Amino acid sequence: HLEEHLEKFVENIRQLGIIVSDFQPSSQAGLNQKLNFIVTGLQDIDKCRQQLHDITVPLEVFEYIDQGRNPQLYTKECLERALAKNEQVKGKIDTMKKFKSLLIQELSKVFPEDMAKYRSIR
């Protein structure tokens, strides 16, 4: 995770340079062109990093960024989805266990042939 540290260092250096050159520059205002070149280089480096890592960039992050809200809503939605999936898995396992137990009990109480079938052939 060096891209974040590099971006933070670049931002700090740009802020320091602006605070140092906040005076009256008599020469050509090359600060805008320098900032544009730095931003282009940073974008190229970020694209190269994302292509080397080949991460699955989802559309939800971009949507939440363009909307102007925090990622807390997406985090809560993902947590709720994971909790619902775990609850559904637990319910399915409990239902399968209860069905197996009830079938075994009905077989033992009615016909052992069905019990032997469900125990060996299934």
Binding site: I18, Q24, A29, N36, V39, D46, T56, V57, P58
Partner: protein, 97 residues
Amino acid sequence: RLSTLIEFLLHRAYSELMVLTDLLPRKSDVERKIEIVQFASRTRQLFVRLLALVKWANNAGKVEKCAMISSFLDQQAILFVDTADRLASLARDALVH
């Protein structure tokens, strides 16, 4: 993506800077101060974008893990929905016979 929006903002800023420097031969000290303030605002926006990128990269592996878990959960839910639809078709849609 981020590269698309980055390049779009860069092209917009370059076009604005060119349109503002086209009439540079008629700029005063107040115009220079306004241009410096605009450049400082652009730098602050770039710093905010870098901070947002850092906050996103600080939770990127967890985001990928949660996305994989969500994909697995969607697959499991699709399988469960198919099983439920088959059971419904067998129990309340083909009992005409």
